Write a protein that holds these residues in place. Structure first.
Motif, PDB file in Angstrom:
ATOM      1  N   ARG A 103      -9.790  27.768  43.233  1.00 41.65           N
ATOM      2  CA  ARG A 103     -10.951  28.618  42.981  1.00 41.65           C
ATOM      3  C   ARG A 103     -12.139  27.802  42.529  1.00 41.65           C
ATOM      4  NH1 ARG A 103      -7.324  28.798  38.737  1.00 41.65           N
ATOM      5  NH2 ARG A 103      -6.122  30.129  40.172  1.00 41.65           N
ATOM      6  N   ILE A 153     -15.041  25.590  41.557  1.00 41.22           N
ATOM      7  CA  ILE A 153     -15.546  24.296  41.971  1.00 41.22           C
ATOM      8  C   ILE A 153     -14.613  23.622  42.955  1.00 41.22           C
ATOM      9  CG2 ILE A 153     -16.035  21.955  41.173  1.00 41.22           C
ATOM     10  CD1 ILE A 153     -17.210  23.240  38.609  1.00 41.22           C
ATOM     11  N   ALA A 212      -2.470  23.272  44.267  1.00 42.34           N
ATOM     12  CA  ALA A 212      -2.381  24.354  43.295  1.00 42.34           C
ATOM     13  C   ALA A 212      -1.114  24.112  42.477  1.00 42.34           C
ATOM     14  CB  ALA A 212      -2.340  25.706  43.996  1.00 42.34           C
ATOM     15  N   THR A 213      -0.980  24.778  41.339  1.00 44.44           N
ATOM     16  CA  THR A 213       0.195  24.535  40.488  1.00 44.44           C
ATOM     17  C   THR A 213       1.452  25.315  40.900  1.00 44.44           C
ATOM     18  OG1 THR A 213      -0.432  26.218  38.872  1.00 44.44           O
ATOM     19  CG2 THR A 213      -1.267  23.978  38.542  1.00 44.44           C
ATOM     20  N   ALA A 256      -8.618  18.888  39.299  1.00 44.44           N
ATOM     21  CA  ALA A 256      -7.704  19.730  38.547  1.00 44.44           C
ATOM     22  C   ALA A 256      -7.890  19.516  37.057  1.00 44.44           C
ATOM     23  CB  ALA A 256      -6.259  19.431  38.919  1.00 44.44           C
ATOM     24  N   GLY A 257      -7.895  20.602  36.301  1.00 40.59           N
ATOM     25  CA  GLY A 257      -7.887  20.448  34.855  1.00 40.59           C
ATOM     26  C   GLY A 257      -7.881  21.746  34.087  1.00 40.59           C
ATOM     27  N   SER A 317     -16.215  14.992  36.277  1.00 38.59           N
ATOM     28  CA  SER A 317     -16.307  14.742  34.853  1.00 38.59           C
ATOM     29  C   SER A 317     -16.906  15.995  34.211  1.00 38.59           C
ATOM     30  CB  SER A 317     -17.135  13.477  34.607  1.00 38.59           C
ATOM     31  OG  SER A 317     -17.303  13.228  33.222  1.00 38.59           O
ATOM     32  N   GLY A 337     -22.811  20.651  34.745  1.00 41.18           N
ATOM     33  CA  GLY A 337     -23.249  21.357  33.553  1.00 41.18           C
ATOM     34  C   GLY A 337     -22.662  22.764  33.528  1.00 41.18           C
TER      35      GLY A 337
HETATM   36  N1  LIG Z   1     -16.801  25.224  35.133  1.00 41.18           N
HETATM   37  C1  LIG Z   1     -17.687  24.373  34.610  1.00 41.18           C
HETATM   38  O1  LIG Z   1     -18.787  24.784  34.255  1.00 41.18           O
HETATM   39  C2  LIG Z   1     -17.352  22.913  34.423  1.00 41.18           C
HETATM   40  C3  LIG Z   1     -18.182  22.153  33.603  1.00 41.18           C
HETATM   41  C4  LIG Z   1     -17.904  20.811  33.397  1.00 41.18           C
HETATM   42  C5  LIG Z   1     -16.790  20.249  34.017  1.00 41.18           C
HETATM   43  N2  LIG Z   1     -15.983  20.982  34.801  1.00 41.18           N
HETATM   44  C6  LIG Z   1     -14.828  20.301  35.421  1.00 41.18           C
HETATM   45  O2  LIG Z   1     -14.761  20.612  36.824  1.00 41.18           O
HETATM   46  C7  LIG Z   1     -13.397  20.729  37.244  1.00 41.18           C
HETATM   47  C8  LIG Z   1     -13.195  22.146  37.764  1.00 41.18           C
HETATM   48  O3  LIG Z   1     -13.057  22.993  36.618  1.00 41.18           O
HETATM   49  P1  LIG Z   1     -13.036  24.599  36.652  1.00 41.18           P
HETATM   50  O4  LIG Z   1     -13.617  25.106  35.349  1.00 41.18           O
HETATM   51  O5  LIG Z   1     -13.662  24.998  37.966  1.00 41.18           O
HETATM   52  O6  LIG Z   1     -11.440  24.891  36.686  1.00 41.18           O
HETATM   53  P2  LIG Z   1     -10.702  26.302  37.031  1.00 41.18           P
HETATM   54  O7  LIG Z   1     -11.602  27.230  37.828  1.00 41.18           O
HETATM   55  O8  LIG Z   1     -10.043  26.796  35.758  1.00 41.18           O
HETATM   56  O9  LIG Z   1      -9.511  25.817  38.014  1.00 41.18           O
HETATM   57  C9  LIG Z   1      -8.430  25.018  37.519  1.00 41.18           C
HETATM   58  C10 LIG Z   1      -7.773  24.330  38.707  1.00 41.18           C
HETATM   59  O10 LIG Z   1      -6.979  23.206  38.292  1.00 41.18           O
HETATM   60  C11 LIG Z   1      -5.592  23.497  38.539  1.00 41.18           C
HETATM   61  N3  LIG Z   1      -4.679  23.008  37.477  1.00 41.18           N
HETATM   62  C12 LIG Z   1      -4.589  23.409  36.184  1.00 41.18           C
HETATM   63  N4  LIG Z   1      -3.609  22.724  35.533  1.00 41.18           N
HETATM   64  C13 LIG Z   1      -3.056  21.863  36.420  1.00 41.18           C
HETATM   65  C14 LIG Z   1      -1.989  20.836  36.428  1.00 41.18           C
HETATM   66  N5  LIG Z   1      -1.257  20.551  35.314  1.00 41.18           N
HETATM   67  N6  LIG Z   1      -1.758  20.175  37.594  1.00 41.18           N
HETATM   68  C15 LIG Z   1      -2.447  20.426  38.723  1.00 41.18           C
HETATM   69  N7  LIG Z   1      -3.423  21.342  38.777  1.00 41.18           N
HETATM   70  C16 LIG Z   1      -3.769  22.066  37.689  1.00 41.18           C
HETATM   71  C17 LIG Z   1      -5.498  25.006  38.735  1.00 41.18           C
HETATM   72  O11 LIG Z   1      -4.398  25.359  39.563  1.00 41.18           O
HETATM   73  P3  LIG Z   1      -3.922  26.894  39.703  1.00 41.18           P
HETATM   74  O12 LIG Z   1      -5.075  27.669  40.281  1.00 41.18           O
HETATM   75  O13 LIG Z   1      -2.732  26.777  40.613  1.00 41.18           O
HETATM   76  O14 LIG Z   1      -3.607  27.260  38.281  1.00 41.18           O
HETATM   77  C18 LIG Z   1      -6.830  25.315  39.379  1.00 41.18           C
HETATM   78  O15 LIG Z   1      -6.791  25.101  40.792  1.00 41.18           O
HETATM   79  C19 LIG Z   1     -12.540  20.401  36.022  1.00 41.18           C
HETATM   80  O16 LIG Z   1     -12.151  19.021  36.007  1.00 41.18           O
HETATM   81  C20 LIG Z   1     -13.457  20.687  34.847  1.00 41.18           C
HETATM   82  O17 LIG Z   1     -13.019  19.940  33.708  1.00 41.18           O
HETATM   83  C21 LIG Z   1     -16.240  22.294  35.019  1.00 41.18           C
END
Ligand SMILES: NC(=O)c1ccc[n+]([C@@H]2O[C@H](COP(=O)([O-])OP(=O)(O)OC[C@H]3O[C@@H](n4cnc5c(N)ncnc54)[C@H](OP(=O)(O)O)[C@@H]3O)[C@@H](O)[C@H]2O)c1
Ligand SMILES: NC(=O)c1ccc[n+]([C@@H]2O[C@H](COP(=O)([O-])OP(=O)(O)OC[C@H]3O[C@@H](n4cnc5c(N)ncnc54)[C@H](OP(=O)(O)O)[C@@H]3O)[C@@H](O)[C@H]2O)c1
Ligand SMILES: NC(=O)c1ccc[n+]([C@@H]2O[C@H](COP(=O)([O-])OP(=O)(O)OC[C@H]3O[C@@H](n4cnc5c(N)ncnc54)[C@H](OP(=O)(O)O)[C@@H]3O)[C@@H](O)[C@H]2O)c1
Ligand SMILES: NC(=O)c1ccc[n+]([C@@H]2O[C@H](COP(=O)([O-])OP(=O)(O)OC[C@H]3O[C@@H](n4cnc5c(N)ncnc54)[C@H](OP(=O)(O)O)[C@@H]3O)[C@@H](O)[C@H]2O)c1
Lengths: 244, 230, 244, 230
Positions: A15, A17, A36-37, A87-88, A137, A182
């Protein structure tokens, strides 16, 4: 007929990003493997990508899984020539309440996974004399956020790792870069109130939250021939929330 | 017709690659040279998708005449690329007032002047890209370049301030910092083990000037082959 | 008996940060020359420093004055071996209202003055194989502030100038550094309301405005033997307002 | 009596210079070594103004026992200097899991663990200094040091987060990033044209641990002779 496109691996592509990055790299002409997990999540990815990608279950905390996934890709699709470490999760807490697990799980999921996956894909990139490692990051690796000492340390560590690796691999024409989002509109910001989203957008010079596509566009650029002389950098995509 | 881009110093090198790329991207490009003859060559290269004008960016009167001309004949400047530059290097003990001033004027003052002059059109459009060419030496210091390094670092800070001012109108303001671009000891310092080409810089400017970089403002985009890393 | 202490020159030493720097360098054992923009201001400095310093009138916009002042110091007190570039003003305006004068006056007072004074003192430092050039910058050279494009450009320019000069002069054991203050309690913040000072202090990790002495302490450190292996850096003194 | 400082890895080099300087500054210094024999040598060097304890910072149980001991016998740790470290360099292709993990644990995990353990005493005192030893290579990248560079950069970001958390209680958290410190090709890269000495680092830590740096938090203090500049 055999799979002939260059292969990209995007971790956590279910989903937001990760999904937007995967779909954009497909549009750019890559064969995309997303993770995916769960198997169920992996099957959804498979269907979304159609015949130009594959979904695989992966927990990036486990070296045996990482090794198995990349071996599977190499045996079925081709060598991973674009790696997007996306992933995170977060486990936020002020330090006085940040447990050993809270710390270790975040460092392992973010920084150890980048080390493990980067190391595992180098040989194929070296043989190709082409490679893109693109680590997602965060603005929080730059702009201090209380409660996220674990996440900030991991993301800053990833950026420094990327610089060292960029020096090591540059003579093989492999670039290693990070993209620091951001405030991007995601499931998490959707869960916040309108008032709090307005407070967020007021801090952004562009006066709005970003979208997953903005991060996909940056990753797309870095993975392309238009960015072949860019390595060891952080590309900030935060709407002027944080400027460097 | 198309949105207008102004690229200063488009005669050769980085500026020429930028101007040609923005044409390919779909902009009507006004490129500048320091002579009327150079300006004609640009008009001839660009044909229907651009124009050449003579401009010395040291002179406010010329800057104002050039933008006015563009507004009268082609449309508002919606993409400004501040690229024109020279060097006058010397160790500080041998750096004259003229060598200091001329570099500050051509690089930093011109960015102030041209940026100020294009704001109204961008504000009305609620669209704009100001892209300033900086340098790696604004970060990784070189003896003998105190004037040039000061100017380029000034440009970057200028850009951050202006990005904050103009962001609500959807105008982005960014810098591109080239490394060693070809216009052995040098390429050994670069992680990629080769010098850059003007097209590498054009590619970065093209990205920033596009909708693919609509959420990027106030940044420095380093295009230096790993010569300097953040 | 002749003046035997090492000589420091502190521009704009009349009040606040400049005054605190001058007094601290006196306490550290320097003979301090401070400047003010009027003779009357210069006489006040003379009296404050007593027999361990001198006040001189100087407008740093003028090369002939800069040259005359330093020549006077050399002929009466000794070579300037610590130079603290502190004098300055602001002329804030959003760019659409920032005049040619607003721009030029700020660049001249800040960045051109640093170039001019640094160049003028190098010979004496070179002969001594000792020197400290310490430029007062600002958090605003790092953290974007609308309305201050002129001031931010000048201060960032000063920091880059300092790096180039540090490379050039390092083999002569001359260090060149900047100190970047954050919210320091001065005449200007005194003029603000209690409410606005509280808003300011809430953004500072340490939860308070700094004092001129905090900047003096940093300058004192950099001018000392405890900082002889520090050159080309920015020392941030902002209470965690901005972290790098 | 005096405020207590804990300096990890005080046996030799940078840590020894730091410990001796903090003694001269007026702190009661607890210094650590990896052996009981090394710990005795410290007790003997410090005499009345310090104590030596054996500590392997890889082990949480030892960290907790060491701080508890200090609290029982000397007082709360009000200055923590995280200095203990080693390197295990290798190109990424030759960098084993153990070589990665051990460096992350000794450097970054130890900073997390020790910082967490000392917070309560500092919070009660409304005074504290956490000073983490980083490195220039967290900024100016070196091939072969991906583990070490990741850890030290992590430490710096950790420090910023913690500085924001603890600042209202007047606890500062900062990093000192040494360049090449002596423990020809190297010194040519340095602007000052010489290697640093442990005392240069002790001087920077001494400054940060003093009232002269009471308004400095969340920063990196570069002590590298102009090897790397911001
Ligand atoms: N959203 C923001 O504004 C923002 C800001 C700064 C940085 N980031 C960074 O951008 C990246 C995307 O973040 P997001 O907020 O978009 O995340 P998210 O929508 O919560 O999606 C998490 C994704 O990572 C997977 N995941 C979680 N735990 C895992 C594991 N142990 N092994 C493998 N996969 C795993 C999930 O798999 P499932 O779907 O199968 O659970 C999912 O596909 C991350 O690195 C985050 O730190 C995001
Ligand atoms: N090359 C590099 O490695 C490098 C590295 C870092 C940054 N940069 C930056 O990239 C930009 C372009 O550099 P370049 O290497 O392409 O330089 P270049 O090949 O020498 O081209 C300089 C251009 O600027 C124009 N110009 C010079 N003085 C001018 C003035 N007073 N008014 C108006 N135009 C003027 C020239 O016009 P005429 O042809 O009419 O003389 C020419 O078009 C500069 O800002 C430079 O500082 C370059
Ligand atoms: N206050 C802060 O929070 C803060 C924050 C960031 C940076 N800074 C920087 O720290 C330094 C000290 O600033 P401040 O706010 O403390 O200044 P201030 O209290 O307003 O004092 C200004 C000083 O500079 C002198 N001056 C003004 N114009 C001059 C000229 N043309 N030539 C020579 N001297 C001139 C004044 O002389 P007279 O007294 O004779 O007029 C006075 O001594 C400045 O460089 C400032 O940019 C301050
Ligand atoms: N030297 C440089 O140029 C340089 C440059 C940048 C950063 N640094 C950093 O400065 C710090 C000190 O470096 P140094 O050059 O002084 O190193 P050093 O001379 O080798 O001393 C290392 C110290 O750490 C201790 N130590 C090692 N492993 C340990 C463990 N598992 N648990 C507890 N203590 C341990 C050692 O104890 P024993 O004596 O008992 O073995 C010794 O006291 C390190 O964080 C290093 O990364 C140094």
């Amino acid at each position: 007929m055999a799979q002939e496109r260059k292969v990209a691996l995007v971790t956590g592509a279910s989903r937001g990003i990760g999904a937007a990055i995967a779909q954009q790299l497909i549009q750019d002409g890559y064969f995309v493997v997303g993770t995916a997990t769960s198997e169920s999540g992996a099957q959804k990815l498979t269907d979304s990508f159609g015949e130009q990608g594959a979904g695989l279950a992966l927990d990036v905390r486990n070296l045996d899984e990482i090794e198995a996934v990349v071996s599977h890709i190499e045996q079925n699709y081709g060598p991973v020539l674009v790696l997007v470490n996306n992933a995170g999760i977060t486990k936020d807490n002020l330090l006085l309440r940040m447990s050993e697990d809270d710390w270790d799980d975040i460092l392992n999921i973010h920084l150890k996974a980048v080390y493990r996956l980067s190391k595992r894909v180098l040989k194929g990139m070296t043989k190709a004399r082409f490679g893109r490692i693109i680590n997602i990051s965060s603005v929080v690796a730059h702009f201090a956020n209380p409660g996220q000492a674990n996440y900030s340390a991991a993301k800053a560590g990833i950026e420094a790792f990327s610089r060292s690796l960029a020096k090591e691999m540059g003579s093989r024409q492999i670039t290693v870069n990070s993209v620091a989002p951001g405030f991007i509109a995601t499931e998490m910001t959707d869960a916040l109130s309108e008032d709090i989203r307005k407070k967020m957008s007021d801090q952004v010079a562009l006066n709005r939250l970003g979208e997953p596509q903005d991060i996909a566009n940056a990753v797309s650029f870095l993975a392309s021939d238009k960015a072949g002389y860019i390595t060891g950098t952080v590309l900030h995509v935060n709407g002027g929330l944080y400027m460097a």
